Each structure stands twice: as structure tokens, then as C-alpha cells.
């Protein structure tokens, strides 16, 4: 059976022929209560002191108990299970080439990374999850050290010179759809370039970038509160209902598509692209539940360096490791160093027993490095040797969708609600933050009576 | 798209690695999530805390 | 009266997200009912449901 499956192509012998031969059987949960199962065909069925000699079924591989998102974790049995859960949650937010068809798809939100890489330390389940075809993340030289205190708590120190070379750069795509329609008998919406004297309501924004048909051409830089689609509805002389960009977008028009909807009316979709260079506050994560923002970025002359001139791309704090107990992170670093020096791809299937930390250390010691992965680093600012020896190695990190430019918000004065005449809600509506009941109670405990009065009466709506 | 090769999928501007299994309703991709429910036609026996029945069997 | 969230918009942020959304299960126990027994990881989920993949929060 193994040889026939080895020659799977040009023989049409497959899983159905394996099942029909009577060697593989499907067992559900109810029938599972009446069987005896083994991890391993020979390691649990040899001759030793007798535990059970009436086995009825055997596992194919024990690492098939994990799901799709948990099968990308290297050495998941060396981690804490809450950290495995957190990585299974954050693997869905990892940014990368989400599909090979992204240049046609006009999706509302899309993130694509410039240079995705397959992991140096991989699991055998990744081949069936197609992770090496559509990867989400870059292998990075990671040094675990306390350098300047900017990586404290969960923060990350990044290399600015690496970032300038394309490290974790990405494109953010947004699509705007607008549909002209004949809603009323005397109400018609048309795609046209608005003109100031013939349009009843014209905003302070400029309409010069539009064409005569009211649609902006691809390849034009656009910014905050600019006009991309010119739509006007007649007034029973015309009311302008043109759509604008989101605030602080600052993108470039990528593709403009015109078509007819189901009703037969003109339909337009415009895609706008924007590059996202990683910044202070952008969220980065490992494959082991170690998430955190970028604390600061240093150039290559300021980052610590080894004897060979290697500077880490990312410095993480050693305080994250001991409480969270993600030893799989360190084993992945050590295996990644061994794999990068050897020239192979490391294997991190969960229950192997053919890979040990001692074996990986013995493999690393042959290439001229310290067996536990430590190196002697030098101070970037002063050039002096660091007294401690820094654990450094390649580790697969991902970039998450949560960037600080999509979350920064401020409001002095602006729009108010129609009903209660209080400020609006949300970033997109230029809304205000909520001074809730707990904040009111905290100010009561403070005793700041006039501050509490200003927040609840003067900063919000006053009336007579 | 049933039974088509990778070249045919690329000629139709479809990703060969796309697994499918979803619906396109008004242009938006929609997926049906499986819902757990209690199995039918089988006898279960339970016991409630403050109910008047000491033992109850349901089917 | 109808159930909600049976059909959801397919998550297309990354390929792992798409696959995990296409292979997702749901329990119709309400999130407001606050009990540890339905949320616990049972012994019968060996090889049927991933023990690690679950949302954080009310679900």
C-alpha cells in the first residue's frame, strides 16, 4: 500500500482504493467509545510489560487533532495552551497574499504584503494548508534583549534600515461603490462633473480631478475629503450627492470599473491603494502568542551587532518569556538558526521524538556558533561589548491588521446628533469619546466638581 | 467551475487555490456555518435541580 | 424569532482565515447565559474539533 501510494500519479491508486481495501475505517464519536486506540503502530504494540494487547485501531498521526490555524504553530507542545489559543486567534489577522486573484477582486478591505516568506521552521501540515504557496509573514533576525527600555512590557524595537529596504511593507486596498438610480419619477441621479452655479450644495472640496463623466481616472493621487465620484440629483437646480474619501486616506486611485447592475442602471466601483510602511504602534506577533506594538525604530548604526556585522531586525523583551512560558519560541529560534546555516527547512511537527533541544544544539555547534544560540553582541552607541550574551536567531513573525493610523482619533468640535444634540459616534463620523458612568464616578471620587461639570455640561451640549 | 483545470481557472480569472464552498449573494461572498443540535430519535435521561421530577427521560 | 448569524460574510484577510471560516462550527447556546459546562473542552473532542482554536470573549 505504501509503494502504491508512493506512485500515486500515473497509477490512479488513491485514498478511495486505500479505504476500499479494508485498511482504513471511519469512526465517529459513538463508535469511538468501544474501540482501543494507539498513538504509534509499533511503539505501542511491541512486546513489553503488558498494558493492553487488544488494540482495535491505530492513529494515523496524533498531530491531526489540531485545526487549520493551530497547525501552523511550530512546536505547539512546548507552549502554554492559552498561548496556543491566542496564536490560533491571531493567525486569522496575519497579513499576506490572501489570494492570487487579488488584482481583479474589488474587495471592500484588503491587505497584501510585499515580500511574504515561507517559514524556515515549518510543520508537515502546512503542505496541505498551502501555507508555502500563500504565506503571511517574514522570517526576521530576532534578538531577545533589554536594549534601551523601549521594548518593555510587550513592545518591540524594530530596525529602521531594514524597514527602508522593504521589511514588512504592505498595501492597503479600499473599494468605493456608487450606484446612480431613478428613485423618483422626478428624481434622477446622474454621473457628471458638478458645476458651482448649477449645483445647490457644493462642499469646499475641489472637483478638478474628476473627468466630464464624474469619475476620477486611475493613476491620480487623492487625499482627505477629495471627490472621487461625481453624482448629482435634480431638485424639484440640482443637489450634489457626490461621495468623498475617508479622512486622512492619502492614497492613489488603482482601478476604476463601470458596469450595469441588475436594474440596468450605471454602476461604478473604484479601488484606491495606499502603502503602509510599518511605524511606531503597528502591531506585530510571533507564532507563539507573543504580540506587541513597535516601541521605537533604530537605524542600523544604532542597533547592536555581532562579530559578523549582523544586526537584529527585531528586539523583543525577555520579560515576555518566563510568565507566558512560550519555550516553543526559543526552540523555533534555535531551529531557525540551524536551518539557515545548514540550508534546509526545519521540521517542527508536534509529537516527533526524533528532534530534541540537545540534538538541535549539537547540530548548531558544528557551524561555529554557541550551542545554546547565544552570541556576543556589541553596543551600537558606544561600541563596547555587552556583558551578557544575547540569544539571537531567525524567527517567523507576522504583521497584523491593527495599525495606529486606522485608530488615531481626535475631535475639538464638529458634528452633533439630531436628537440629543451631543457629538457623534465613531472615527468616520468625526465623533467624540464617551465620558461614561465609571469615569463620572472616578471624578466624583476625585472631587473635581467643575471638571465633572465641564465634561458633562460644557464640553458636551450647553442649552438655555 | 466544476472539474476545470488550473489553466481554465486562470483563463476565467479564478484562483486555482481557492477552495470554494461559499455563496455569492448580491456580489458578497457568504458562508454557511454548521450549527450543533441535540441528536434525535435517541433516549436521554437527565436530572434537574429544583424540578418536581426526580428523573426525566426524553426522546 | 429566527436564528441569527447562520450565514456570515466570508473573511478574506488571509488564506488561513478563509479556511478556518469555511471549517467553523457553532453552538446555539446564547452568549448571555453564563455557564462553564457548555463552554468547557469535553473529552469527546479528540480528533473531531481543534482543542486550541476558539475565540476569546463572550463566545
Amino acid at each position: 500500500h505504501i509503494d502504491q501510494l508512493k506512485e500515486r500519479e500515473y497509477n490512479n491508486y488513491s485514498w478511495q482504493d486505500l479505504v476500499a481495501s479494508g485498511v482504513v475505517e471511519y469512526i465517529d464519536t459513538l463508535e469511538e467509545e468501544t474501540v482501543m486506540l494507539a498513538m504509534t503502530p509499533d511503539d505501542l504494540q511491541e512486546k513489553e510489560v503488558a498494558y493492553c494487547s487488544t488494540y482495535t485501531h491505530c492513529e494515523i498521526h496524533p498531530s491531526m487533532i489540531l485545526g487549520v490555524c493551530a497547525s501552523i504553530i511550530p512546536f505547539p507542545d512546548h507552549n502554554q495552551s492559552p498561548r496556543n489559543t491566542y496564536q490560533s486567534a491571531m493567525g486569522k489577522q496575519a497579513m499576506g497574499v490572501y489570494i492570487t486573484n487579488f488584482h481583479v477582486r474589488m474587495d471592500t478591505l484588503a491587505h497584501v504584503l510585499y515580500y511574504p516568506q515561507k517559514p524556515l521552521v515549518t510543520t508537515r501540515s502546512m503542505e496541505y494548508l498551502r501555507f508555502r504557496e500563500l504565506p503571511a509573514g517574514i522570517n526576521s533576525i530576532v534578538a531577545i534583549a533589554s536594549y534601551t527600555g523601549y521594548n518593555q512590557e510587550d513592545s518591540v524595537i524594530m530596525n529602521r534600515s531594514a524597514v527602508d529596504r522593504g521589511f514588512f511593507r504592505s498595501v492597503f486596498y479600499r473599494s468605493y461603490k456608487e450606484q446612480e438610480s431613478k428613485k423618483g419619477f422626478d428624481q434622477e441621479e446622474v454621473f457628471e462633473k458638478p458645476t458651482r452655479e448649477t449645483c445647490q450644495g457644493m462642499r469646499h472640496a475641489i472637483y478638478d480631478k474628476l473627468d466630464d463623466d464624474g469619475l476620477i481616472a486611475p493613476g491620480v493621487r487623492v487625499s482627505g475629503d477629495d471627490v472621487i465620484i461625481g453624482k448629482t440629483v435634480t431638485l424639484p437646480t440640482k443637489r450634489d450627492c457626490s461621495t468623498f474619501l475617508r479622512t486622512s486616506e492619502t492614497g492613489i486611485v488603482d482601478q476604476v470599473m463601470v458596469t450595469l447592475n441588475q436594474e440596468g442602471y450605471k454602476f461604478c466601483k473604484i479601488r484606491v491603494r495606499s502603502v503602509r510602511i510599518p511605524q511606531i504602534g503597528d502591531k506585530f506577533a510571533s507564532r507563539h502568542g507573543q504580540k506587541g506594538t513597535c516601541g521605537i525604530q533604530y537605524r542600523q548604526e544604532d542597533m547592536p551587532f555581532t562579530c559578523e556585522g549582523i544586526t537584529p531586525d527585531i528586539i523583543i523583551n525577555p520579560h515576555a518569556i518566563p510568565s507566558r512560558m512560550t519555550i516553543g519560541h526559543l526552540i523555533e529560534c534555535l531551529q531557525g538558526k540551524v536551518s539557515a546555516n545548514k540550508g534546509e527547512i526545519g521540521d517542527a511537527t508536534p509529537f516527533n521524538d526524533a528532534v530534541n533541544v540537545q540534538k538541535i544544539s549539537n547540530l548548531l555547534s558544528d557551524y561555529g556558533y554557541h550551542l545554546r544560540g547565544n552570541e556576543v553582541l556589541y553596543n551600537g552607541f558606544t561600541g563596547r561589548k555587552i556583558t551578557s550574551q544575547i540569544f539571537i536567531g531567525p524567527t517567523y513573525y507576522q504583521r497584523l491588521k491593527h495599525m495606529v493610523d486606522d485608530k488615531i482619533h481626535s475631535r475639538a468640535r464638529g458634528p452633533i446628533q439630531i436628537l440629543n444634540r451631543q457629538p457623534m459616534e465613531g472615527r468616520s463620523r468625526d465623533g467624540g469619546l464617551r465620558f461614561g458612568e465609571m469615569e463620572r464616578d472616578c471624578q466624583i471620587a476625585h472631587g473635581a466638581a467643575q471638571f465633572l461639570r465641564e465634561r458633562l455640561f460644557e464640553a458636551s451640549d450647553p442649552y438655555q | 467551475l466544476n472539474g476545470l483545470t488550473d489553466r481554465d481557472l486562470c483563463e476565467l480569472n479564478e484562483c486555482p487555490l481557492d477552495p470554494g464552498g461559499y455563496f455569492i449573494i448580491n456580489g458578497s461572498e457568504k458562508v454557511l456555518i454548521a450549527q450543533e443540535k441535540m441528536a434525535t430519535n435517541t433516549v436521554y435521561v437527565f436530572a434537574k435541580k429544583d424540578s418536581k421530577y426526580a428523573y426525566t427521560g426524553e426522546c | 424569532q429566527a436564528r441569527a448569524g447562520v450565514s456570515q460574510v466570508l473573511n478574506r484577510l488571509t488564506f488561513a482565515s478563509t479556511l478556518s471560516h469555511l471549517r467553523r462550527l457553532n453552538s446555539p447556546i446564547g452568549r448571555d447565559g453564563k455557564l462553564a459546562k457548555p463552554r468547557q473542552l469535553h473529552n469527546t473532542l479528540w480528533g473531531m474539533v481543534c482543542p486550541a482554536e476558539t475565540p476569546e470573549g463572550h463566545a
Binding site: 505504501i2 501510494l5 508512493k6 500515486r8 488513491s14 485514498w15 478511495q16 486505500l18 482504513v24 504509534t40 503502530p41 509499533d42 494515523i60 498521526h61 491531526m64 487549520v68 508537515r124 503542505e127 496541505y128 494548508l129 526524533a354 | 477552495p19 470554494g20 464552498g21 454557511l32 | 479556511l19 469555511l22 471549517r23
Partner: peptide, 28 residues
Amino acid sequence: EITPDLWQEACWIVISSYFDEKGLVRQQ
């Protein structure tokens, strides 16, 4: 006709055949 020493190759060949035939959205 038994595979005592090499089992990883056989196991992952079987798993590869399974995922080649069925897929990942086969239940849907």
C-alpha cells in the same frame, strides 16, 4: 511486509493521499 523503522514517511504519504483526494471544504 511491515514498516518498523520508517513510519513517518508512510504516515505522511497516507495523509498526503487523503488530502489530495478529499480536500478541506469537502463536508460543505
